[PDB]
Amino acid sequence: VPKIAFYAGLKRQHEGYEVLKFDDVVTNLGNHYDPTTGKFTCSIPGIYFFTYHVLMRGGDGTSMWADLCKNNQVRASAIAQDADQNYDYASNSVVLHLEPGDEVYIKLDGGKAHGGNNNKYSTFSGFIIYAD
Amino acid sequence: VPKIAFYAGLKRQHEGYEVLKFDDVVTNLGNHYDPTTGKFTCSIPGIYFFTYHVLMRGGDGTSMWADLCKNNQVRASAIAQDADQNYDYASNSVVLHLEPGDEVYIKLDGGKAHGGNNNKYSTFSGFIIYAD
Amino acid sequence: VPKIAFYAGLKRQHEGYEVLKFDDVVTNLGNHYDPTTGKFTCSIPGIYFFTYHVLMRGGDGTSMWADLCKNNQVRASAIAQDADQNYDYASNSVVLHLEPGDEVYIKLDGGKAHGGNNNKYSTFSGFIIYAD
Amino acid sequence: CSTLVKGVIYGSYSVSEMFPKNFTNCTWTLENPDPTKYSIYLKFSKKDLSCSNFSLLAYQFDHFSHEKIKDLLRKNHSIMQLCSSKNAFVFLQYDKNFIQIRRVSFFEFLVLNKVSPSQFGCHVLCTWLESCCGIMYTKCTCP
Amino acid sequence: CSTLVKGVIYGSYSVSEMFPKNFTNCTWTLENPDPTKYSIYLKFSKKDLSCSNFSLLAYQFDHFSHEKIKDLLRKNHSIMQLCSSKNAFVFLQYDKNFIQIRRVSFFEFLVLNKVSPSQFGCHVLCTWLESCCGIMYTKCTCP
Amino acid sequence: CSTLVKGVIYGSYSVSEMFPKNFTNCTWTLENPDPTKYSIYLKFSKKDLSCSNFSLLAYQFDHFSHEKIKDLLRKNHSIMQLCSSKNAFVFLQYDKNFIQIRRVSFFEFLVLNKVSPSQFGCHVLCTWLESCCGIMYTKCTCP
Ligand SMILES: [Ca+2]
Ligand SMILES: [Ca+2]
Ligand SMILES: [Ca+2]
Ligand SMILES: [Ca+2]
Ligand SMILES: [Ca+2]
Ligand SMILES: [Ca+2]
Ligand SMILES: [Ca+2]
């Protein structure tokens, strides 16, 4: 069986509309996630489950959108909003079908994420459930 | 051996105490989720994992309860609350044992959900982990 | 695949830097989760997925930290914060590699968790994905 | 001696009904279905209630634990003294998971919805508004 | 007869362009890409717009359902009457998933970003600020 | 030349101790364990501090990157100048992931808990309250 599963915290703060690069890689079983680019590139076709928790940076920015983007389409959207500028999460979970080359990644869509260093507040988890 | 896994966003907004019908189906392996009714009907008995993220409707309603109901009983409860009426998620995650016919569904228990068209802010994910 | 999977809600209120004991056990396949201590002790080494949702108490308490601690180290951190003292979840998901004896548990790192009785607002889910 | 009335939006109990045992040491409990959603309001009638050889202890807690009840009793800094209440009618609010009344003339409670009170629930509370005097009332307003 | 203009930050449509059909019963729709993020502002020009044999109904909804449109029309309590508007220019804000204008002289809309308006988006709205008069304007400020 | 003091609630360092190298180009770093939870307060003493042939640069950042430090230095719009500080004692608050002091008389810092300050932490800060003058003090109050 194929063993694909990863989890990585967000070591560095992000902002704007940039792909989140979760460099705090705890698990990268199969090495199908690349912290340098921040994209999970499928290699074995199959149905994968991805969950991401992205902590909105506290203090500045009352809204943050973190969309799990599959290739060039937004396959999930999460909004972390707090009018008092608190640490609310923009989290969501997806069960997507993926073909080889499909780059699944979390992209900020108009907010400032939180750089947890080694704390691993903002995370990106995901694993293959079945292989086609 | 059996491949059951679904994911669907909430195309239409909801309100009150009605079953959430996630009609934005991205994955419906086995066709064991019905967007018309909004219920995942188990057919192959086994241990299933369900996660749901339900975005509270911003602007109106300061609290929203989305309980993952198994048959006629609340197997999980999630409350999205924000006194400033923001977009907070009533998300939760369960690992339930299911027999054939057990209809697992996300049911609002107050407050108004958010309808995101194809955005898929509010989602219902779930897959079978083991079969008996 | 050996069958390890659990899910439990928070029957009793919690507070301060103490391990969360999710005693409202719904699934405890393999009996690898102990509600009396609140720790999931790995026995068969392998790659496990854990998710926890921890509702923080409304009323008293403005911020609550719930870190999924693996043995003596924080493998994920979640902060539930709301300046208006609302209900918010300190949730996060991890995909950790575990050896026999590793004790994964959710420990509050400040603030008070909500005791949901049978409601199962605050939950602790997790299952083995691969048996090494 | 412990009976718990689990599912009731409203309930009227006499002193004899809530303690239907010869032994004077009994506990009557009322479980709040969801403290995130509901706030339980208690009402005490002293029209015929007596405490010649009985102690009325009104308190709340979160989980069933005898040591917790003992520690709360030894605290004795916020436990209600129903017998030693000057006003004839006692109104109490308990936004906690459990409410227990132990024994050492009736009383009615109300499991109100905190944010969206039902038509019946707010009607009962509006009748309890006839205290006389400081009272606790919710968002829903009624003349 | 139903065309929907899905992806546009801005758009100028004449009455003839938005209803390019001989049949007088047609619907013109504008999908809000993300109501969590964007608020659609509508602008109506009555300089050459006429309603001698045409009805202009301006409304919003959340999902495509004919029964919903019929019920909203029968409600007739908040539907805008473009023809019966005293002011020459009509400014409307629609923070809902769909905007549809049905037919029973142009008009321009603006899919503005709610929290971080773009340079062009706030520039267009600042030009619409020339109403004259009560108007709805957003956080972004411009003389 | 880069040493980082990772885990310390409190720490007192002399200029010689924090830069124990003959080379004048060195960086001393202090990692904030959790900016969601802790705010690092810095204290600078100019009683015997001298800058005859040394430059004291006080700044903060989020990640280890030489290019980031160079860009911050080229910015030079909010970097603290310890040597050119009129007041004898300099109090700085740094609610960011890293604090680095580079070299081109001691100083003490405090990793305080932002929301629930410990007994020791709020005591040390209460002593630092003797600035004289504008200062930044936390929620915890002390005479
Ligand atoms: Ca988006
Ligand atoms: Ca419920
Ligand atoms: Ca939240
Ligand atoms: Ca921590
Ligand atoms: Ca919140
Ligand atoms: Ca708030
Ligand atoms: Ca507020």
Author numbering:
A (entry chain E), B (entry chain H), C (entry chain I): 6 to 137
D (entry chain B), E (entry chain C), F (entry chain A): 4 to 107, 125 to 152, 163 to 173
The authors write:
The adhesion-GPCR Brain-specific Angiogenesis Inhibitor-3 (BAI3) plays a crucial role in organizing synapses in the brain. C1qls are thought to form large 18-meric assemblies, suggesting a higher oligomeric state of the complex and a potentially different interaction mode.
We then determined the structure of the mouse C1ql3-BAI3 NTD complex by single-particle cryoEM to a resolution of 2.8 Å. At the core of the complex, three globular C1q-like domains form a trimeric quaternary structure with four Ca2+-ions bound at the trimeric symmetry axis consistent with structures of the isolated C1q-like domain11. Three BAI3 NTDs bind to the C1ql3 trimer. Each BAI3 NTD interacts with the C1ql3 trimer at a composite interface between two C1ql3 molecules, creating a heterohexamer. Within the C1ql3-BAI3 interface, one C1ql3 copy establishes a Ca2+-mediated interaction with the BAI3 NTD. Asp180 and Asp232 of the C1q-like domain direct the coordination of the Ca2+-ion, while Lys66 and Asp63 of the BAI3 NTD participate in the water-mediated coordination of the Ca2+-ion. Furthermore, C1ql3 Trp188, BAI3 Lys66, and BAI3 Tyr67 engage in a π-stacking interaction that further stabilizes the complex. The second C1q-like domain in the binding interface also forms extensive interactions with the BAI3 NTD, where C1ql3 Tyr244 and Asn242 engage in hydrogen bonds with BAI3 Asp63, while C1ql3 Asn240 forms a hydrogen bond with BAI3 Glu60. Superposition of the BAI3 NTD onto the C1r CUB domain highlights a conserved core of β strands, with the primary distinction being that the BAI3 NTD contains additional α helices outside the core β sheet that are not usually present in CUB domains and that may mediate additional, as yet unidentified interactions by the NTD.
